[model samples]
Target: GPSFPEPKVVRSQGGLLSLKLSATPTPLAIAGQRATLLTYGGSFPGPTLRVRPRDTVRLTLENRLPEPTNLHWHGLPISPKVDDPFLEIPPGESWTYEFTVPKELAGTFWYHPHLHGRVAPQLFAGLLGALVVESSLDAIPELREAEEHLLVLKDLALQGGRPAPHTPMDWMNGKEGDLVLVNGALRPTLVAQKATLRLRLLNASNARYYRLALQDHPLYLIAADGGFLEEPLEVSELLLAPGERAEVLVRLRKEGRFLLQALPYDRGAMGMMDMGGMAHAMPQGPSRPETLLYLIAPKNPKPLPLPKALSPFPTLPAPVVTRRLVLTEDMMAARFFINGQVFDHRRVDLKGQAQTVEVWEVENQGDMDHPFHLHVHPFQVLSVGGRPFPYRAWKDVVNLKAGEVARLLVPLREKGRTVFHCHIVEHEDRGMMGVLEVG
Candidate 1:
């Protein structure tokens, strides 16, 4: 019912980029209802930052909110000090992020507030955007001339015309909002020429998982969270968890209307025994299909073939070390844990030497799904549920079903301090995190 509201694009010039943003409370109409949400530069979901590799980006953020907050470049290979979530800007203070984009990272990424306990609420209230690393492969004829769309998917709940407050159920089970926003609009329609369309989807939701499918069309997945794939993987459905990103190429041969929808997916529910030996389960909302976007392809469409080869998918050296991390939870305390311990700033939960490959066996012993996210470098999913990957791909976030074990090949290439935690912000804020020291 509404037109897509693409975030304003800010591109680098002469290998340098400079910008300023103010995080303030702004009133905006969402689906015909007005709500005061937190925004950057007076725009909900901030703006799209476009930069090439090795470009220096200097962005100053003025915090006008009532609490401390900081920005994290979700999937970039940035040093801890530059993309530091530990550096919080007090209310009324300003913080500047100046970092050089790594020469190898070129794909879909995003930015969001990462203020530990406050991350879930702030992100739900609106504090996120897309960060795209322009790739040299983008100049390929198939991709260069295609109609590109940047979709940052976010959801929020409202009560009495304001943002809804989180309840206990929200804390234990991740909150999936009733209102789903695509690029800050509801079911926005996109008019495109009948050609190859590049749809870059970034799941910016705090906890929700999106099982996406394009009705009657095959989706060619060209890139994952870290960067481009060596070849496109054709699939009928693509699942993106919180903090995950996917780039798909779809060729529209004829003029018609198409729908991009999110199908139902069960990530599992939490259950526990009560004091009187009564069984209790966390309240879960109905899983239903949602129309994320409507596409109207007009006439006079030119034909474009999908790229066969993208880039080289390198294989990491054999891991010299192996580590195990068990993900567990405490229902009564509404807390989660990594390796039986909660996150402590002073505690180094894990350590590694720079430029070494390691095998991390992450097991989710809890009853609910948890998407694990690592900072700095991207990891290759070696196996899930003891099954090896069908193909090679790089990812920053991997969803682990209840009682599932996934092994990841992580290269500790960037030496610094960082944290790895559940993509569910509430879980992360509640203790499902650990710090890493690589040097």
Candidate 2:
């Protein structure tokens, strides 16, 4: 009702846009120190791509690193033939990502390597970045005037210029790091002019859950994962799992310096096994929270009206097909499985008719939790533990706890082979992955 600003148009007039991204070894500044990194466009957290909806991005990626890797557009439901992670370009090779952005897509997404075995290491070495899709709706005058920051929350465990060598222990539990990076900067500080600020938060870490909160300021949750929520939810804190993205608005009215931090969250035993487990209730509260950024609000701030309605959820169609999958692990053998089977690209585990709605239920039976992700389709969290979710949300990643079940209503598209796996990079590479062949 903010006098619906300028007439909104969501498409660009330009021809296809070319994005040249080279993955090579370069020096990057971290915590005021220069360190060598294997990164895209030679910067940690790579480079940000801001574009209108439905704009086709022609990405030319050159790999100058010593190993093989491919890019996965983390939150977008894209076909494996184009924007996929399987086409591993070896060292000194180049790959082109030729995919059209969906007009219906709008939100914060990320790009990273899904190369088997080396995912955790490559990402730990800094091969990732944020991709934001916007529309004229996002260009409203009020939001347009507010300063915006896209913060990719990540952690790395490195010694010198090399990554800390991996161990079996590290393999079982995903590797967590002591050094936290806010947009690849260590303990960075920003000057907020006591105004409405749009903070786009992404948990890009391989294995940490952030209980994100502004010191004393509440966050107005505007969007989650695939796109905007039906309405904004104001809360003191939020939990972001790896491969998850959230957009929030904060009006810093009080003139003071406050810390945006990750309060200690108990991941039960699952947090140690890489990826994240939802925070569990404990006799003793959360672990000690760590400060991520210093926000200095030096003046009085004007109130920003939170959007009453963000976006409508897709109509839930009746499912004609349903499938059940299990996530489990054998600690002694260091093997992970889906329905008692490891990932075999040659084998088609799940099949579906394209352009149909199917219900997928994934239950975790191991000691740890898992974040389930599917390519080619972003799913709506219909229910968690058999209870319908309070609101509507779309996501490519859903966190499941031990003995917990997640029911997803999926609309299958793109007739080809794609993957559905645990986003716990290590677990996925180790075997908890399956292929879905669409006809």
Best by TM-score: 1
- The Cα local distance difference test for each model comes to 0.87, 0.79
Clashing pairs in 2: 173-272, 173-273, 174-273, 174-274
lDDT of 2: 0.79
Candidate 2 per-residue lDDT over residues 105-171, each given as its tens digit: 8888888998877897888778888888885658766567777778889887668865566677556
Compared with the true structure, model 1 gives a TM-score of 0.95
For every candidate structure, what is the RMSD over all alpha carbons to the true structure, in angstroms? 2.1, 6.0
Question: What TM-score would every model get versus the actual structure?
Answer: 0.95, 0.91
Error of 2 at 302 (Å): 2.2
lDDT of 1 at 13: 95
